[PDB]
Each structure stands twice: as C-alpha cells, then as structure tokens.
Amino acid sequence: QQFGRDIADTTDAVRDPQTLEILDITPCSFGGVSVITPGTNTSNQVAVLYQDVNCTEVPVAIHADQLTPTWRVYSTGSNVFQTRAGCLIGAEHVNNSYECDIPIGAGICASYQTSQSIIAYTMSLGAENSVAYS
Amino acid sequence: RTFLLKYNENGTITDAVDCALDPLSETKCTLKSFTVEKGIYQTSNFRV
Amino acid sequence: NNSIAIPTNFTISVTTEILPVSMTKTSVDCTMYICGDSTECSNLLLQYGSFCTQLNRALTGIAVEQDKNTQEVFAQVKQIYKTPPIKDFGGFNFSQILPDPSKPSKRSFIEDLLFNKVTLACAQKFNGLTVLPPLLTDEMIAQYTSALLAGTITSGWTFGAGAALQIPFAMQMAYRFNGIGVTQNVLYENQKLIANQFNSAIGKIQDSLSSTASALGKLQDVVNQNAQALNTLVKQLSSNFGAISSVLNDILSRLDPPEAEVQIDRLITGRLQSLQTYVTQQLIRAAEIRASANLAATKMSECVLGQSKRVDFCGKGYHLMSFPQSAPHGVVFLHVTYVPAQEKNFTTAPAICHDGKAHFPREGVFVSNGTHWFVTQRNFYEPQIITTDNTFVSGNCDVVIGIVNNTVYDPLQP
Amino acid sequence: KFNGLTVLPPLLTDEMIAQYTSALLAGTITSGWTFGAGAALQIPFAMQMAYRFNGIGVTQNVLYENQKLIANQFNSAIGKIQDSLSSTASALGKLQD
Amino acid sequence: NNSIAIPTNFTISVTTEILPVSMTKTSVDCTMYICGDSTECSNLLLQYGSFCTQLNRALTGIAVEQDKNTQEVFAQVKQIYKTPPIKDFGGFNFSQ
Amino acid sequence: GRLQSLQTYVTQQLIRAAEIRASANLAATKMSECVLGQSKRVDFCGKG
Amino acid sequence: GRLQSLQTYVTQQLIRAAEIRASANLAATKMSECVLGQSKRVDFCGKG
Numbered sequence: 001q002q003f004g005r006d007i008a009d010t011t012d013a014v015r016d017p018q019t020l021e022i023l024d025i026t027p028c029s030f031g032g033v034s035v036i037t038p039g040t041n042t043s044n045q046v047a048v049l050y051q052d053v054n055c056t057e058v059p060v061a062i063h064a065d066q067l068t069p070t071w072r073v074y075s076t077g078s079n080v081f082q083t084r085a086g087c088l089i090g091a092e093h094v095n096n097s098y099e100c101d102i103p104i105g106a107g108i109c110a111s112y113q114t115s116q117s118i119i120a121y122t123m124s125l126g127a128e129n130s131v132a133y134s
Numbered sequence: 135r136t137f138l139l140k141y142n143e144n145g146t147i148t149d150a151v152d153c154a155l156d157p158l159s160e161t162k163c164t165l166k167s168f169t170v171e172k173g174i175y176q177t178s179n180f181r182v
Numbered sequence: 183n184n185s186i187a188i189p190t191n192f193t194i195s196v197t198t199e200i201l202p203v204s205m206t207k208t209s210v211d212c213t214m215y216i217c218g219d220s221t222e223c224s225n226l227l228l229q230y231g232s233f234c235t236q237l238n239r240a241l242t243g244i245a246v247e248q249d250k251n252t253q254e255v256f257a258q259v260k261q262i263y264k265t266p267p268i269k270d271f272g273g274f275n276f277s278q279i280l281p282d283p284s285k286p287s288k289r290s291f292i293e294d295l296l297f298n299k300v301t302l303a304c305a306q307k308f309n310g311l312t313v314l315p316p317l318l319t320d321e322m323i324a325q326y327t328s329a330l331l332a333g334t335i336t337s338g339w340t341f342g343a344g345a346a347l348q349i350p351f352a353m354q355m356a357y358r359f360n361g362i363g364v365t366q367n368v369l370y371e372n373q374k375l376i377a378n379q380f381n382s383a384i385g386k387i388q389d390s391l392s393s394t395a396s397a398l399g400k401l402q403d404v405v406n407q408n409a410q411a412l413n414t415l416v417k418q419l420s421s422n423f424g425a426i427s428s429v430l431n432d433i434l435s436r437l438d439p440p441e442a443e444v445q446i447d448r449l450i451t452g453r454l455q456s457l458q459t460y461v462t463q464q465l466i467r468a469a470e471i472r473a474s475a476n477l478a479a480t481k482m483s484e485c486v487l488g489q490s491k492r493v494d495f496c497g498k499g500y501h502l503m504s505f506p507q508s509a510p511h512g513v514v515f516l517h518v519t520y521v522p523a524q525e526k527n528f529t530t531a532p533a534i535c536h537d538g539k540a541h542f543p544r545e546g547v548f549v550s551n552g553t554h555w556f557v558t559q560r561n562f563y564e565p566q567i568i569t570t571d572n573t574f575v576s577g578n579c580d581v582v583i584g585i586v587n588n589t590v591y592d593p594l595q596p
Numbered sequence: 597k598f599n600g601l602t603v604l605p606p607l608l609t610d611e612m613i614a615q616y617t618s619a620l621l622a623g624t625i626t627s628g629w630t631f632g633a634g635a636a637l638q639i640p641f642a643m644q645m646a647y648r649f650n651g652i653g654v655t656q657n658v659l660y661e662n663q664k665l666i667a668n669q670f671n672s673a674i675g676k677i678q679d680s681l682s683s684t685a686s687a688l689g690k691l692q693d
Numbered sequence: 694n695n696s697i698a699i700p701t702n703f704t705i706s707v708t709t710e711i712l713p714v715s716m717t718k719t720s721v722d723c724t725m726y727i728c729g730d731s732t733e734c735s736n737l738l739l740q741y742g743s744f745c746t747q748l749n750r751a752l753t754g755i756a757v758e759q760d761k762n763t764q765e766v767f768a769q770v771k772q773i774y775k776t777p778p779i780k781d782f783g784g785f786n787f788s789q
Numbered sequence: 790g791r792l793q794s795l796q797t798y799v800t801q802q803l804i805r806a807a808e809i810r811a812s813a814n815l816a817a818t819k820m821s822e823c824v825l826g827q828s829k830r831v832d833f834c835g836k837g
Numbered sequence: 838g839r840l841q842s843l844q845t846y847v848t849q850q851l852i853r854a855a856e857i858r859a860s861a862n863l864a865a866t867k868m869s870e871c872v873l874g875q876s877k878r879v880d881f882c883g884k885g
C-alpha cells in the first residue's frame with residue numbers, strides 16, 4: 001500500500017516512505033463560525049460560538065499565535081463555556097433557566113439581561129405545574 | 135481589506151466600518167447591512 | 183326496507199401512526215466544499231456572482247424552519263405538567279406509556295423500543311459537510327410529551343383551552359363517549375371490561391414493535407433521504423468532470439495560472455452544478471416534511487387536546503383520545519379508537535302510530551325482538567320501553583311510510 | 597417513442613378504480629358512516645337520510661313528512677349533472693389542465 | 694333588534710368538485726437519451742460522476758410516491774360491496 | 790446543455806408532484822370526511 | 838452564467854409559490870370554517 005482512500009476518495013492515511021510508520025491525515029478548519037448578537041443598535045459586546053472544537057485546540061488549529069492580537073482575546077480566557085453544540089466564548093453562564101429568545105443549539109440559548117452582559121443557559125421548557133388529581 | 139462604505143444622498147461618507155476589527159464586524163460585510171434585528175448569524179471563515 | 187344493524191357489544195382498539203416532524207439538520211459552507219484552503223481558488227469563485235451567499239442562506243432558511251416546525255408541533259402548551267404519584271386511574275394501567283422515573287432519562291418505556299427500532303447510520307465533516315445540533319435535544323423532546331399526557335389523562339381536554347381543570351379518568355371517557363353518539367351509562371356498567379381490553383391493547387402493540395415486524399416504515403425513508411443525498415454529494419467530489427485530475431491540489435501543481443484559468447473554471451462550474459442540485463432537492467424535501475409537520479401540528483391540536491368528530495382523521499374508527507410519544511425525527515400517535523363488535527339482526531321501522539298520532543325517536547333507533555318493540559341508542563343496543571318521554575309527537579299517521587302500530591306505556595299516573 | 601421516454605402503467609388500472617368507487621358507492625348507500633369505522637352495519641337509506649338531518653340541526657320529522665318531494669327533487673339535481681357536463685363549456689377544467 | 698329569519702322550505706342541490714390525485718408516471722434513461730446509439734459519447738457521460746444514476750431514482754421516487762396517492766385516496770376500505778338485487782331506496786333512483 | 794435541459798425537467802416534475810401530493814392529501818382527507826362519514830365543517834364538502 | 842441566474846430564481850420562486858399556496862389554502866380552510874360558521878375543532882381558530 002501507499003495511501004488509503006475513503007467514501008470521499010480522499011487520502012486520509014498515508015505510509016511514511018522513510019520510517020514505514022502508519023499515520024493519519026486530517027484537516028480541522030471548522031469554517032462555520034457563528035456569533036450571537038443582539039440588535040446591532042443596542043450593544044457591541046457579543047458572544048461567539050465555535051462548532052465542535054472543544055475550544056482546546058483553537059490556538060493550534062488556526063495558528064492564532066502568529067495572528068493579530070485581537071483574535072487571541074476571544075481565543076482563550078475565563079469566559080469559556082462548553083456545550084453539546086461546541087464551546088461558547090463571550091457569555092456568562094447562569095444556573096437559572098428562562099424562556100429563551102435566541103436559539104443557538106443543543107438546548108442552549110442567549111439573552112440580554114443584567115452592569116450588562118449576555119447570559120447563556122439551558123432553556124426553560126415552561127413553568128412547572130401539577131394537577132390535583134384524585 | 136474588504137471595506138463596506140455607505141453613502142448618503144449627497145455621496146459624502148459620514149461613517150465607515152472596517153470588517154476585520156472583530157468577528158462582530160465580520161457579520162456586517164457577510165450580511166451587507168448594519169441595522170439588523172437581534173438574532174444569530176454565521177460568517178464565512180476569513181482567518182489565514 | 184325494515185332491517186337495521188345495531189351492535190350488541192363493543193371492543194376498544196389502539197392503532198399507531200407515524201408522521202415525520204423534522205429532518206436531518208445540514209448546512210454547507212461556501213468555500214470549503216468547492217475548494218478548501220486554496221486562496222487561489224476562491225478568487226475564481228468570486229467572479230461567478232453570489233451563489234454560495236444564496237445557497238447557504240437558503241440552506242440556513244431550512245434550519246430556521248426545522249426548529250420552528252418542532253416548536254409548532256410539540257410546544258403546544260406553555261406549562262410542563264406532571265402526572266400525580268397516585269396511579270389510580272379507575273382500573274387502567276399507564277406505566278408503559280409514561281416515562282420511568284428510575285431511569286436517568288426521560289424517554290418512556292416504548293420510546294426506547296422506538297429509538298432502537300429505527301436508526302440514523304457522521305465522520306466526513308472534513309470536506310465542508312457539517313451537522314448542526316437540533317434546537318430541542320432528545321432529553322427535552324421526551325419532557326414535552328410527558329407533560330402532554332399529564333394534561334390529557336388527568337386534566338381532560340381543558341388544559342388545551344386555558345387553565346387545567348382536574349377530572350377523574352373514569353369521568354373523562356364516560357362523557358367522551360357522548361361525542362360519538364352513545365350515552366354515558368355504557369362505561370359505568372363496563373368500566374372493568376374496557377380497562378382490561380385497553381390494557382391488553384397496549385400490550386398487543388408493544389409486542390409487535392418489540393418483534394422483527396418493521397412498523398416504522400415512514401421514518402426510515404426520511405433518514406435515508408437525508409443520508410443518501412449527502413453521500414451522493416460526498417461521492418460526487420471524486421469525479422473529474424472531464425478534468426485531468428479530480429483533485430485541485432494536483433492541478434495547482436500541474437498547470438500554470440495562465441493555463442489553469444480554463445482548467446479550474448470548468449471544475450468550478452461543474453461542482454457548482456453538483457451543489458445547486460443538492461440545495462434544490464433539499465428544499466422540496468423540506469417542503470414535503472413541512473406539509474407533514476403542519477399535519478402533525480394539526481393532529482396535535484385536534485387529535486390530542488380534544489375530541490375530533492372528523493371520520494378517519496385520527497387512526498381508524500371513532501375517536502376517543504390519543505397518546506403522543508417522542509420518536510427520532512418524528513412523532514408517534516397512539517389513537518385509542520372505538521370499534522363496534524358483533525351485532526344482532528334487528529327489524530326496524532321509522533315510527534309508531536298509537537292513537538292516530540305519530541311518535542318519532544328523539545335520540546336513537548327503533549328496534550324489535552320480532553314481536554315487541556324497543557328504543558335504543560344508534561351505536562349501542564340498550565333496549566328501552568317506548569314512553570312519551572323518549573319520543574315527541576308530530577304529524578298524522580298517513581303521511582309517513584313504513585310506520586307500524588304499537589303501544590306506549592304512560593308512567594306519569596300509573 | 598424515441599429518445600428514452602418510457603411511461604410506466606399505473607399500479608391500479610382504470611377498471612379497478614371504478615370498483616373502489618363502486619364499493620364506496622354501495623358502502624355510502626347501505627351503511628352510511630359505519631363501514632368507515634369498523635364492521636359494516638346495514639341500515640335503510642330512508643333512515644340514513646333522516647339521521648344526517650339530525651346532524652345538521654334539522655328535526656327528524658322534516659324528512660318523513662316531505663319524503664315524496666325530496667325524491668323528485670334529489671333526482672332532478674342528479675339529472676342536471678348531465679346537462680352541466682355534456683355542454684360545450686366543459687366544467688372539467690382542473691383535470692384537463 | 695327583534696327580526697329573525699327561519700326558512701319555510703329547503704332545496705337539495707349537488708355540485709361537482711374536481712381534485713387531481715395522480716398524473717402519468719415518467720421515466721428517462723440517460724444511456725440512450727443524451728448519446729443516442731453512440732458508445733463514443735457515453736464515456737464522456739461516465740466522467741460526469743453520478744447524475745443520471747441520481748435522476749433515475751428521482752423520477753422513480755415520484756412514480757412510487759404517485760402510486761401511493763392512488764391507494765391513499767381510493768383504497769381506504771378493506772371490503773368490496775355490491776348493490777342488492779332489489780332497488781327500494783325510498784324513491785331515490787341511483788341507477789345513474 | 791442536454792443535462793441542464795434534463796435537470797430543469799426533473800425540477801419541474803418534482804415541483805408539480807409536490808402540488809399533486811397536497812391536492813391528493815386534500816382529496817384523501819375529503820375521502821375520509823366527505824364520503825365515509827358526516828362532516829360538520831362549514832363549506833368544506835361543496836357549498837352548503 | 839445568466840441562464841443559471843434565472844434557473845436559480847425560477848426554481849426558488851416556484852418553491853416559494855408552494856409555501857404561499859399551502860398557506861393560502863390553510864387560510865381558505867379557516868375562511869370557510871372560522872368565520873362563515875361555528876367551528877368545533879380545538880385550537881384551529883385560536884387558543885381555547
């Protein structure tokens with residue numbers, strides 16, 4: 001063998017012609033970057049959603065070390081929260097649950113609630129209630 | 135850079151927004167507008 | 183002219199019906215699919231106008247509709263009701279259709295069977311094709327249904343019309359039969375009979391779905407369509423469209439840019455046709471599900487939150503009520519329908535003449551053993567003595583065809 | 597025909613389609629609403645004419661006292677279909693489209 | 694304030710309503726359509742990936758779905774009935 | 790050109806087939822309501 | 838490039854035509870039921 005194919009007929013694994021070591025090849029660009037933003041006339045601070053990156057390889061996947069300093073501000077920090085839809089940066093997580101207005105994914109939403117910031121939380125399916133049945 | 139300049143009825147530019155300052159600025163050139171209601175948007179990746 | 187068929191018994195029947203609600207959430211990036219990590223390629227794509235700002239926008243428009251479709255089907259109520267701990271529903275057993283609190287998941291007993299009955303099979307994310315998570319995860323999907331049963335079973339149908347009003351379940355179906363033309367004395371004399379039959383009906387459908395019989399035929403097609411179409415898009419990148427190679431990197435290592443203007447563009451034109459067909463075929467498929475989604479949404483407002491008098495719209499037979507349950511990429515309706523059992527060969531007549539006066543049935547039919555006459559409900563044989571209270575007098579006796587002479591017992595001054 | 601256009605026959609032939617309509621025609625006449633919800637229940641058509649009036653608020657007695665008038669009038673409406681379909685101005689526009 | 698209308702007679706009328714259920718199923722084969730009776734042209738078509746193995750399932754997908762329409766509209770009864778030998782329908786003449 | 794000619798025919802057929810589905814389902818719902826039983830919906834099965 | 842400009846537009850408009858066509862028929866169904874008579878079905882002409 002010299003190289004391996006897949007359903008896409010793309011070279012995913014190749015054999016080293018020198019060390020004869022089995023190794024894999026794959027790119028991780030995650031070009032579908034999304035931002036959660038309120039009305040553009042309301043505020044400038046926003047939250048950026050990264051899709052399926054675990055936000056631990058952000059400086060490595062895009063090589064943000066040699067990039068402009070404005071990209072490294074949102075690349076890492078204490079404002080990091082991980083969802084089932086990816087890692088969300090730029091929002092303060094809250095332990096409450098409201099009827100959300102901004103759909104993001106994986107049951108996580110965003111809002112404009114108070115010192116102002118954008119909060120992200122699991123949406124509230126409704127007001128819990130019980131029926132006095134007998 | 136990719137610049138989006140808006141012109142008044144006279145043609146004099148009163149304000150301009152660069153589309154590389156922050157990922158918020160990437161939204162405007164992606165959508166080709168400024169005053170857009172609240173929601174969620176996706177911008178094509180442009181980092182090199 | 184004078185033969186009628188009135189059932190003498192009845193049986194309860196529970197059927198199933200599958201309807202898709204939301205399809206697979208897919209989105210295609212502009213530059214990644216056509217040519218990834220090539221700034222010399224995106225320059226040539228820029229001269230072909232604005233296609234990917236239309237196709238992705240159209241594809242994103244599916245995502246808004248898909249999340250909206252689930253909201254207008256499942257989030258019909260605004261409060262999450264809870265079933266009471268005391269499962270004393272007048273002889274009925276409801277454990278199989280309600281979520282088990284012991285398990286850490288909110289999926290009910292039959293939803294686990296449904297979730298493994300149909301599958302979805304993921305790893306080809308590298309070449310642009312990605313999958314956005316749905317707005318409502320499967321844990322929350324089961325939570326909506328648990329509240330919806332907690333409203334219909336316990337609060338009647340009033341919870342779909344305002345504040346929930348408590349009611350016994352023996353009460354609920356008692357005058358629910360009043361909506362199909364039979365009085366409410368049937369169930370109170372046959373509550374034990376209907377309870378075991380209803381419980382066995384749940385057991386009968388449970389074994390069929392737990393067996394090898396594939397009853398979820400409609401669900402597999404929509405998953406395959408949103409899987410076969412993507413796989414065709416995956417395989418289509420391996421074709422050269424007549425080029426010297428099917429990969430642009432080799433062409434970038436083969437021909438100079440002056441000589442690559444002709445070569446790359448015909449690849450770019452070919453692959454745009456490949457992507458345009460996918461976005462087009464995704465819209466009609468999204469349009470057909472949306473037509474079915476509104477059908478599911480209508481059945482949510484009609485077949486669940488109340489009693490529907492439309493024939494054969496909720497299952498098969500007379501409607502009593504339904505049990506919505508969560509399913510992957512769809513919903514499952516459990517219509518509990520009323521089916522008449524074996525009947526008796528009756529002899530009928532439109533009217534009775536007593537003293538030259540015509541007595542017509544206020545509510546029901548006129549049936550006879552063969553010598554004596556009785557009145558009963560149209561859809562159930564409960565013979566009664568002909569009185570002046572169950573009939574009303576109108577017209578003479580020489581204007582109605584088929585009238586028969588008979589007597590009427592007068593109970594006011596016996 | 598030429599150039600690869602093949603027409604597959606319908607799964608149900610036109611002859612068998614009429615039999616389902618014939619089955620529905622006998623089902624509607626001799627059963628009414630019972631045969632669509634379980635076992636067929638035979639019932640006189642004169643009776644079934646009454647029980648649909650009760651479904652629209654019309655009293656049971658209106659049919660029986662005016663049975664003769666309805667019989668002549670209902671067939672006249674049926675007979676008007678031929679005059680409305682055999683004319684030059686065809687009413688079958690939707691199918692023709 | 695005190696005027697109501699109650700009809701003293703009634704009229705029975707029948708109206709024709711038209712709704713299509715299915716159309717003629719079509720199928721196109723690319724092997725002889727695009728390149729008619731020429732094996733030197735089909736090899737160019739083979740270099741275009743899989744469109745004509747993708748369009749055939751689209752038309753057949755329509756034809757399979759359209760055959761479902763005929764069964765969904767008419768075949769809603771599990772029994773086949775027949776008219777009784779007598780025709781005592783209370784004055785109604787249904788032979789038309 | 791012929792593939793584009795064939796493609797627009799397939800797209801036209803698929804659009805029209807979906808409308809037949811909407812009409813047939815309306816016909817199917819009518820068959821379940823207008824014929825097999827009695828419908829109290831106003832002005833759904835004809836006029837009156 | 839210009840025929841493909843129209844092919845994209847006409848396909849989308851026909852698809853969007855079906856979206857309105859189902860909605861208009863849905864309104865027409867509500868037009869013969871919710872106003873021209875009294876409707877018995879639940880949550881079809883508003884909540885409650």
Ligand SMILES: *[C@@H]1O[C@H](CO)[C@@H](O)[C@H](O)[C@H]1NC(C)=O
Nearest residue numbers: 039040041042043169170171
């Ligand atoms: C922003 O625009 C919205 C438009 O709906 C308006 O309601 C709101 O008051 C505006 N806010 C500011 C701070 O201009």
Ligand SMILES: *[C@@H]1O[C@H](CO)[C@@H](O)[C@H](O)[C@H]1NC(C)=O
Nearest residue numbers: 052053054055056057082084
């Ligand atoms: C993300 O990184 C953390 C840190 O090691 C790891 O524990 C976690 O499993 C990662 N997420 C996934 C989905 O692998």
Ligand SMILES: *[C@@H]1O[C@H](CO)[C@@H](O)[C@H](O)[C@H]1NC(C)=O
Nearest residue numbers: 092093094095096119120121
């Ligand atoms: C939310 O709850 C978790 C566990 O109870 C806790 O670790 C976390 O600090 C809480 N968050 C806030 C903002 O209090």
Ligand SMILES: *[C@@H]1O[C@H](CO)[C@@H](O)[C@H](O)[C@H]1NC(C)=O
Nearest residue numbers: 183184583584781782783784
């Ligand atoms: C009504 O039934 C009687 C009893 O058989 C029969 O003689 C009579 O002809 C029937 N009526 C009509 C109109 O046929």
Ligand SMILES: *[C@@H]1O[C@H](CO)[C@@H](O)[C@H](O)[C@H]1NC(C)=O
Nearest residue numbers: 694695696697698699700875
């Ligand atoms: C209607 O109007 C008349 C005179 O204008 C009046 O006598 C009557 O009381 C009114 N009825 C009602 C219900 O207002």
